[PDB]
Amino acid sequence: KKSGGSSKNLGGKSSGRRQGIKKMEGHYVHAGNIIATQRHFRWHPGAHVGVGKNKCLYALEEGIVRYTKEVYVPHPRNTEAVDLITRLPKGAVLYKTFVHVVPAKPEGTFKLVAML
RNA sequence: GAAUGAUUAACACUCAUUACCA
RNA sequence: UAGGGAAUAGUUUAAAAAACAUCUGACUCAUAUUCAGAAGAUGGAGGUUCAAUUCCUCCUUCCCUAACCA
RNA sequence: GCUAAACCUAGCCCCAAACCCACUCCACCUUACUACCAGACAACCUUAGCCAAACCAUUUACCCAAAUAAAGUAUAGGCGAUAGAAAUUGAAACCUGGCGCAAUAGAUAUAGUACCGCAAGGGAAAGAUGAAAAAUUAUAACCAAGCAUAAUAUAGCAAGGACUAACCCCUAUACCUUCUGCAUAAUGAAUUAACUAGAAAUAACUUUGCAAGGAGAGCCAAAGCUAAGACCCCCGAAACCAGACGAGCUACCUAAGAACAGCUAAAAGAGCACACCCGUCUAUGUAGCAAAAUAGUGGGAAGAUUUAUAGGUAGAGGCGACAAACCUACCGAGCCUGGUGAUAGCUGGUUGUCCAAGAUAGAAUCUUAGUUCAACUUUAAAUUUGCCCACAGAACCCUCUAAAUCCCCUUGUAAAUUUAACUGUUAGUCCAAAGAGGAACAGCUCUUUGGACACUAGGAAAAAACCUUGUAGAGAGAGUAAAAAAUUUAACACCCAUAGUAGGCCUAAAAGCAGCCACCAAUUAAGAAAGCGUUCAAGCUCAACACCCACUACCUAAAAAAUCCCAAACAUAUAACUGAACUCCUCACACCCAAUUGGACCAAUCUAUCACCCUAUAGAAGAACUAAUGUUAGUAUAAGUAACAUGAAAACAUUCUCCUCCGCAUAAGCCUGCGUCAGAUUAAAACGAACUGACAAUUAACAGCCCAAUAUCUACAAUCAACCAACAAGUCAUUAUUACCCUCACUGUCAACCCAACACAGGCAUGCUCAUAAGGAAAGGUUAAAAAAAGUAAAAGGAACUCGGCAAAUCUUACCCCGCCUGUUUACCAAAAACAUCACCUCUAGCAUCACCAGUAUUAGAGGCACCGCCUGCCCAGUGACACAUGUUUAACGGCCGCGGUACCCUAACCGUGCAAAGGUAGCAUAAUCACUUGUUCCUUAAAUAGGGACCUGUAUGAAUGGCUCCACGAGGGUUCAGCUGUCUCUUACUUUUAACCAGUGAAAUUGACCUGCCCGUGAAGAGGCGGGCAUAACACAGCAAGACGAGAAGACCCUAUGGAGCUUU
RNA sequence: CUCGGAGCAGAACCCAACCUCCGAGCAGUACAUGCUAAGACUUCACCAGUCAAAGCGAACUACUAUACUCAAUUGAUCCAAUAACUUGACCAACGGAACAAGUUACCCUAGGGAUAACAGCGCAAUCCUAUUCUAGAGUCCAUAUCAACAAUAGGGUUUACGACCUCGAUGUUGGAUCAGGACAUCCCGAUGGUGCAGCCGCUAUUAAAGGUUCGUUUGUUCAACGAUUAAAGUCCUACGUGAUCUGAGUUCAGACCGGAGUAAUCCAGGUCGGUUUCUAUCUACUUUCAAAUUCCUCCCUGUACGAAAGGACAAGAGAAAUAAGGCCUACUUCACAAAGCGCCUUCCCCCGUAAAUGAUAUCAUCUCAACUUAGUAUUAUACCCACACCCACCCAAGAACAGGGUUUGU
RNA sequence: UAGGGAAUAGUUUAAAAAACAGCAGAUGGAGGUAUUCCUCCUUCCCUAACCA
Ligand SMILES: [K+]
Ligand SMILES: [K+]
Ligand SMILES: [K+]
Ligand SMILES: [K+]
Ligand SMILES: [K+]
Ligand SMILES: [K+]
Ligand SMILES: [K+]
Ligand SMILES: [K+]
Ligand SMILES: [K+]
Ligand SMILES: [K+]
Ligand SMILES: [K+]
Ligand SMILES: [K+]
Ligand SMILES: [K+]
Ligand SMILES: [K+]
Ligand SMILES: [K+]
Ligand SMILES: [K+]
Ligand SMILES: [K+]
Ligand SMILES: [K+]
Ligand SMILES: [K+]
Ligand SMILES: [K+]
Ligand SMILES: [K+]
Ligand SMILES: [K+]
Ligand SMILES: [K+]
Ligand SMILES: [K+]
Ligand SMILES: [K+]
Ligand SMILES: [K+]
Ligand SMILES: [K+]
Ligand SMILES: [Mg+2]
Ligand SMILES: [Mg+2]
Ligand SMILES: [Mg+2]
Ligand SMILES: [Mg+2]
Ligand SMILES: [Mg+2]
Ligand SMILES: [Mg+2]
Ligand SMILES: [Mg+2]
Ligand SMILES: [Mg+2]
Ligand SMILES: [Mg+2]
Ligand SMILES: [Mg+2]
Ligand SMILES: [Mg+2]
Ligand SMILES: [Mg+2]
Ligand SMILES: [Mg+2]
Ligand SMILES: [Mg+2]
Ligand SMILES: [Mg+2]
Ligand SMILES: [Mg+2]
Ligand SMILES: [Mg+2]
Ligand SMILES: [Mg+2]
Ligand SMILES: [Mg+2]
Ligand SMILES: [Mg+2]
Ligand SMILES: [Mg+2]
Ligand SMILES: [Mg+2]
Ligand SMILES: [Mg+2]
Ligand SMILES: [Mg+2]
Ligand SMILES: [Mg+2]
Ligand SMILES: [Mg+2]
Ligand SMILES: [Mg+2]
Ligand SMILES: [Mg+2]
Ligand SMILES: [Mg+2]
Ligand SMILES: [Mg+2]
Ligand SMILES: [Mg+2]
Ligand SMILES: [Mg+2]
Ligand SMILES: [Mg+2]
Ligand SMILES: [Mg+2]
Ligand SMILES: [Mg+2]
Ligand SMILES: [Mg+2]
Ligand SMILES: [Mg+2]
Ligand SMILES: [Mg+2]
Ligand SMILES: [Mg+2]
Ligand SMILES: [Mg+2]
Ligand SMILES: [Mg+2]
Ligand SMILES: [Mg+2]
Ligand SMILES: [Mg+2]
Ligand SMILES: [Mg+2]
Ligand SMILES: [Mg+2]
Ligand SMILES: [Mg+2]
Ligand SMILES: [Mg+2]
Ligand SMILES: [Mg+2]
Ligand SMILES: [Mg+2]
Ligand SMILES: [Mg+2]
Ligand SMILES: [Mg+2]
Ligand SMILES: [Mg+2]
Ligand SMILES: [Mg+2]
Ligand SMILES: [Mg+2]
Ligand SMILES: [Mg+2]
Ligand SMILES: [Mg+2]
Ligand SMILES: [Mg+2]
Ligand SMILES: [Mg+2]
Ligand SMILES: [Mg+2]
Ligand SMILES: [Mg+2]
Ligand SMILES: [Mg+2]
Ligand SMILES: [Mg+2]
Ligand SMILES: [Mg+2]
Ligand SMILES: [Mg+2]
Ligand SMILES: [Mg+2]
Ligand SMILES: [Mg+2]
Ligand SMILES: [Mg+2]
Ligand SMILES: [Mg+2]
Ligand SMILES: [Mg+2]
Ligand SMILES: [Mg+2]
Ligand SMILES: [Mg+2]
Ligand SMILES: [Mg+2]
Ligand SMILES: [Mg+2]
Ligand SMILES: [Mg+2]
Ligand SMILES: [Mg+2]
Ligand SMILES: [Mg+2]
Ligand SMILES: [Mg+2]
Ligand SMILES: [Mg+2]
Ligand SMILES: [Mg+2]
Ligand SMILES: [Mg+2]
Ligand SMILES: [Mg+2]
Ligand SMILES: [Mg+2]
Ligand SMILES: [Mg+2]
Ligand SMILES: [Mg+2]
Ligand SMILES: [Mg+2]
Ligand SMILES: [Mg+2]
Ligand SMILES: [Mg+2]
Ligand SMILES: [Mg+2]
Ligand SMILES: [Mg+2]
Ligand SMILES: [Mg+2]
Ligand SMILES: [Mg+2]
Ligand SMILES: [Mg+2]
Ligand SMILES: [Mg+2]
Ligand SMILES: [Mg+2]
Ligand SMILES: [Mg+2]
Ligand SMILES: [Mg+2]
Ligand SMILES: [Mg+2]
Ligand SMILES: [Mg+2]
Ligand SMILES: [Mg+2]
Ligand SMILES: [Mg+2]
Ligand SMILES: [Mg+2]
Ligand SMILES: [Mg+2]
Ligand SMILES: [Mg+2]
Ligand SMILES: [Mg+2]
Ligand SMILES: [Mg+2]
Ligand SMILES: [Mg+2]
Ligand SMILES: [Mg+2]
Ligand SMILES: [Mg+2]
Ligand SMILES: [Mg+2]
Ligand SMILES: [Mg+2]
Ligand SMILES: [Mg+2]
Ligand SMILES: [Mg+2]
């Protein structure tokens, strides 16, 4: 019985974050429902979709979730993204995946309240 | 260590040169 | 096989200094001692920091310890 | 037919009621049960711990004076576990009963007896007629295991299907527990009978009552509330604490006793050697003679000796020449009782029938042998989707542009979620697939997806994990599913060869063929040469011509293990057939998973009411046993086995043979225990009797049982006590005065005997006998096998045996290590080098009326070391102790060095430099001293890892936790000369025992059941029991030890447990 | 030992190893990092953690301004401090006990084959063997002999690995005793090759009937050494065999030395000492009756061979050892007999190859062509073989039983 | 962490001086009415904490 060695690799024991899409294409969401969670921007917020401080995407309106591909124009103040687009060959357009909520209900209705 | 010179009255030294198991 | 420590001038130590050794001079008839001068160093490689012997990392050499119970 | 079986009483339990309490005479706290004398001692003083807190450390309910209620409230608490009031409230109360037991129950109880223990203390078993036994030839019978009547016939979990037929044929791997998985060679179990194990709240559910109320004050209430039904086991540690009991064993001590021949020396912890004490070595023995013995051999035996008697020290302790010894057979700390039903996440066990549902992501945890939450699983309830899935849709960065997934209408289907209430599972195996670790090893380890297994059946030889197949019954129908192993191998050309030229160059030589360049040309045809060869050449081939139909294939290679190959066989008759619990068929249908969960029934018993040859509806409960190394009893198996016993003849008078270990007596112990008579009860055999009943008996002079007061007295051992010389300094003695006229009581007295469970080869003090005047018998009979035991003798050799000369024989030499010596120790595996010890040294203490001590520093106590001889070096920084102003102290705890260079190499008188309290000094050294190591050399042997003497840096020797020499001593360890021998070469013969046979008597462990073969294979991985073969009428007796993973002891090694205990400690 | 990122885990989520890599236990800027509140996420439970519309109050009409940048950057309850707000652990064993280390070989109990040591089994890295390949060595020459880089198989003796049976026990080294088996043969037999003249060797094929020594030191298995031998084989059998033995070693309780430790005590160390039970129920077995192996001497022969030196084989003869089976005349132990140290007997084959003839293929060719020879045994033969006289007696027969004799039953 | 106290030349003292160390040299820092009055901060000491 010879004495053995030991592994020099510590840590690495974190559990899965359980991130990803919570509401798939066509699903009905109420306002506030989290649509997806992510560590980096895999899906970008579209129409009526808010983005949390932790990049969490949530519904701003009640409706149907839709995923589309759209042209990506960064904010002129986002230095890193602007540096990329300026170095692109002319004629080249960046695309990204966006998630939207199509509002299902109208903001309200006018109802007869009195006959004065 | 060897040879060679330099050195000495001649040497030694020194310097320089050469070639099982429970 | 596992573990801890160390590496500084040619030599041996210190927190970039002393000691001698080495070279220079003086004293001696000459040598030593002595006196006055002079030079010389942070095992290797990589990185942090404006700056690293002094913060970390791997390798080499060496040392010390353990390597058991039926 | 035996053994047995059966019984209904004895009494007992729980309540009620009631307060309770004895007495002849005599004896009884001293040694209890003892007629009768001078004393004066006197009682109180907090429970602890197990356990719970998942350890444990504060803490952890224990009637304390009225049931209920307030209330598990206030409050307390590692604010944890758990503990827990009061104010206030306020009831009933008629002993003579029982849905209690009925001889393993109920009290332990026929009895606190027998029996066990020194003691405290522990503590049984069992009986059965009838009206009458002054009816006893009575009261029938049938029933457990075990046997008998009546042994057995190839073959195999002992049966099943069957059959004319018991067997023969075919099929079939006991049971429980425990596991991933057990025929397993894993656990338990000889068998029978009896006994022997699920206790309850919180909620919820079900069924009644009443209902915004319910309830027979308290409580609850936004349909509640009241009542009922229905769920929560048994045995087991090592421990801990309290109070008693123990020093008749043993350790040590106190008082007063006893023993020690002979010889040598005559001085002796001196030698030889009895008694006596001890226990070195070997054999025997190992449920024995013996819970430590016997035989031989050994150590001691005038001393630190051995030993009888009484007394002392007691468990948080004693005692100890320290062995963790010994303290009543078992002491890392006694025993008993109690706390106590200690606790156990650990093993084992857990009792009627039938059906149903039912296999598993993970998280935390002093946690991974367990728990809680999730998940899965079960039941009840609610109302609404569940599952399968169409498009569309879900990322860039990056190398496998993976198999897929997610989402999802339709559709095919019938589930799903939610509410209420719980338990169990949370120690996992193989296969396919994607990977990781390892060795692209594992029946290996780790994740993922799926399957199977832990449930069925068929198949793959046997076969958990592969294939086929699942839903349950009957059938002497039927169709099928999976389902059988194929292959066979290496020929090959014939014929012929002149030449520019030995091409050029290089080279000693290079001539087709060491290298470099060219590679042209003669002959119809032949490379300025493709393979050999020659030192260079020669020489043999191939590519050429001619001859001429070689008319090639151009794909490939073996083998070996251990008990014995392994179905038998077969190349030839027409695609089929066989084959399940699948499916069909006639009839029927709840009727094949562990843990767990739901449900339907039910034996017997008691009670209410029925019933009335053994029942019904209900209510109850000590309500069901193929398993706990279970408890008690009975009887088997081993087994008529192991083992045990009586000297001979005779007229039972006596005599003979042989032992003598003794023997007689006293003390202690014991208590009628071989005397008579009468019984046939019996001695490990036997009708004499030690057993039963009765009747007798031991007679004091021996011994025990003693003494008026007060004061006073007592320097001068003993040893033949005389010479002589001692130390350890000793067992023996009065007087004065007063008082005192009396007599022979009382008790022990036996034996073949005590302590050891026994009629035990053991233990057991003293006197005398010293081999006997006393006391005894080794052989039940026979035979004369093996193996075994105890002896005797042995050719030639003489340690060649062996770890070792163990044992035996003979009887001796020299040396080494350790310890000075005599002595002491682990009673029962160690007798030693361990302890003690004379000697030496350190430390403490200036003193009296209970040890030390009736002592006083030349003393006493606490320690170290270990006579003597030579010695005991350096260090006080650290720790300790002492001392105080620094400090002192090692024969206190302890310690006592590097790195680099210099005489060729080894080495360094030497030199540099750092460190320290000091740097290991003298000695000794391959050691009983870490390895290296069988170091080197001399001696020893034919040969030596042995032994002796040296050399040694031992970098881990070393100086009172002592170093080194040396006399004497040693059942210490090692070596050796000589001799001796059956130790051996190499065994043999005889005797005794045992043995075997006959007769009597008659155990133990063990035992699931057995109808109890061998081979290969298989398998929970080593098969009498499975597969394939082979073998095979039946049954004794004697041997053997290869297997039955043989018996015996719940492995002492190892790990685990929030299990113990002893010891040490900063 | 807690936390985060990446791979394993390629595409929703999840996913382990004492697996592979890299990090964290802060820092910086704000000071509305103010208040409040729909709807959601969630590390597979809980605890904890995460994102947020609207609204209030601010800011604001220049600020990718509105839950700050940032991946992790962290700690429950009780309790303590504090007027309040609020703060407090490398509680890092990081779901955290308010506070507790050693040692036990003097040990104990409960369990575990859920887990080690022995053996089996699995596996074959390691170990051993064979073949393939043709570099190299062997003067030349690959293949007499040896052999690199590699390749393909086999073996199951080593050291490991795994943890499947066994811990209500499968007794652990070496030796004694008795051996069963494999052949990968050490000796003896039969053959091919040789860098084989001969004598000796080397290598390969075949052969497991028979055989395979005694001693000094060591506990040894081994190893060294002495002396022999035809040879002193390699292995398996629970590293065969302790209900047959042994107990030197190893591995309990005593003790010493060196070393470690404050000590208790301890060490792969060394050293002295240290209890080895069992009456056999079952299986199996208790005359495989009887063919023998080997060395040496003489002779062949100083022949064959060879320059010499040296020096055979076959046949023949003799004498021994061992083994097996018997026996007692003598010797010896002994004495109506049993014994050895004495005497007597002992018998067949071995298949690897070497050669003819002769086809496929009109030569040739020893032929998994037909065939011929070396070249083979029904292994030979041997032993055993007739039986109610049998009460009893005797016995060279024997445990009992059985057997022989009794014409040897006063 | 809490308070108490303290800070003079490199060092240690005095009431702006001497002594040592190497003619230089100082009133820890900031603010205020100046070593000498007060306050905050730094460093250090003292004393008590450092629990959960
Ligand atoms: K997110
Ligand atoms: K405990
Ligand atoms: K009783
Ligand atoms: K069982
Ligand atoms: K088995
Ligand atoms: K098993
Ligand atoms: K067992
Ligand atoms: K006493
Ligand atoms: K068990
Ligand atoms: K547990
Ligand atoms: K099949
Ligand atoms: K040439
Ligand atoms: K008596
Ligand atoms: K005895
Ligand atoms: K002794
Ligand atoms: K000191
Ligand atoms: K020696
Ligand atoms: K020597
Ligand atoms: K002795
Ligand atoms: K046997
Ligand atoms: K923890
Ligand atoms: K392996
Ligand atoms: K075991
Ligand atoms: K020996
Ligand atoms: K059997
Ligand atoms: K004899
Ligand atoms: K041919
Ligand atoms: Mg990860
Ligand atoms: Mg994880
Ligand atoms: Mg001159
Ligand atoms: Mg507890
Ligand atoms: Mg404990
Ligand atoms: Mg009250
Ligand atoms: Mg009773
Ligand atoms: Mg019967
Ligand atoms: Mg059969
Ligand atoms: Mg198992
Ligand atoms: Mg099975
Ligand atoms: Mg069994
Ligand atoms: Mg078990
Ligand atoms: Mg209950
Ligand atoms: Mg306690
Ligand atoms: Mg007590
Ligand atoms: Mg006594
Ligand atoms: Mg006395
Ligand atoms: Mg005498
Ligand atoms: Mg004496
Ligand atoms: Mg004597
Ligand atoms: Mg004593
Ligand atoms: Mg001791
Ligand atoms: Mg001891
Ligand atoms: Mg006792
Ligand atoms: Mg219990
Ligand atoms: Mg079912
Ligand atoms: Mg914890
Ligand atoms: Mg678990
Ligand atoms: Mg759907
Ligand atoms: Mg789980
Ligand atoms: Mg596995
Ligand atoms: Mg030519
Ligand atoms: Mg030429
Ligand atoms: Mg040429
Ligand atoms: Mg030619
Ligand atoms: Mg040539
Ligand atoms: Mg031509
Ligand atoms: Mg040709
Ligand atoms: Mg069916
Ligand atoms: Mg059916
Ligand atoms: Mg009935
Ligand atoms: Mg019952
Ligand atoms: Mg029963
Ligand atoms: Mg039982
Ligand atoms: Mg018997
Ligand atoms: Mg007998
Ligand atoms: Mg008298
Ligand atoms: Mg008498
Ligand atoms: Mg005695
Ligand atoms: Mg007599
Ligand atoms: Mg007798
Ligand atoms: Mg007898
Ligand atoms: Mg007899
Ligand atoms: Mg003899
Ligand atoms: Mg010998
Ligand atoms: Mg001798
Ligand atoms: Mg021998
Ligand atoms: Mg002897
Ligand atoms: Mg002694
Ligand atoms: Mg003893
Ligand atoms: Mg004794
Ligand atoms: Mg003894
Ligand atoms: Mg001693
Ligand atoms: Mg002395
Ligand atoms: Mg000293
Ligand atoms: Mg030198
Ligand atoms: Mg010295
Ligand atoms: Mg040594
Ligand atoms: Mg010897
Ligand atoms: Mg030392
Ligand atoms: Mg010493
Ligand atoms: Mg000392
Ligand atoms: Mg003496
Ligand atoms: Mg001696
Ligand atoms: Mg003695
Ligand atoms: Mg017998
Ligand atoms: Mg008999
Ligand atoms: Mg048994
Ligand atoms: Mg088998
Ligand atoms: Mg028999
Ligand atoms: Mg069996
Ligand atoms: Mg056994
Ligand atoms: Mg056990
Ligand atoms: Mg405890
Ligand atoms: Mg969650
Ligand atoms: Mg807002
Ligand atoms: Mg934790
Ligand atoms: Mg966590
Ligand atoms: Mg010991
Ligand atoms: Mg045990
Ligand atoms: Mg296992
Ligand atoms: Mg093993
Ligand atoms: Mg086995
Ligand atoms: Mg293999
Ligand atoms: Mg060559
Ligand atoms: Mg094997
Ligand atoms: Mg496993
Ligand atoms: Mg067993
Ligand atoms: Mg054999
Ligand atoms: Mg062979
Ligand atoms: Mg063996
Ligand atoms: Mg055996
Ligand atoms: Mg021994
Ligand atoms: Mg020691
Ligand atoms: Mg002894
Ligand atoms: Mg020993
Ligand atoms: Mg034995
Ligand atoms: Mg026997
Ligand atoms: Mg011949
Ligand atoms: Mg021919
Ligand atoms: Mg021909």
From Swiss-Prot:
It comes from the Eukaryota. One of its GO terms (molecular function) is RNA binding. Keywords: Mitochondrion, Ribonucleoprotein, Ribosomal protein, Transit peptide. It is found in: Mitochondrion. The keyword Ribosomal protein applies. GO terms for biological process: mitochondrial translation; translation. GO terms for cellular component: mitochondrial inner membrane; mitochondrial large ribosomal subunit; mitochondrion. Belongs to the bacterial ribosomal protein bL27 family. Component of the mitochondrial large ribosomal subunit (mt-LSU). Mature mammalian 55S mitochondrial ribosomes consist of a small (28S) and a large (39S) subunit. The 28S small subunit contains a 12S ribosomal RNA (12S mt-rRNA) and 30 different proteins. The 39S large subunit contains a 16S rRNA (16S mt-rRNA), a copy of mitochondrial valine transfer RNA (mt-tRNA(Val)), which plays an integral structural role, and 52 different proteins. This is Large ribosomal subunit protein bL27m. It comes from Homo sapiens (Human).
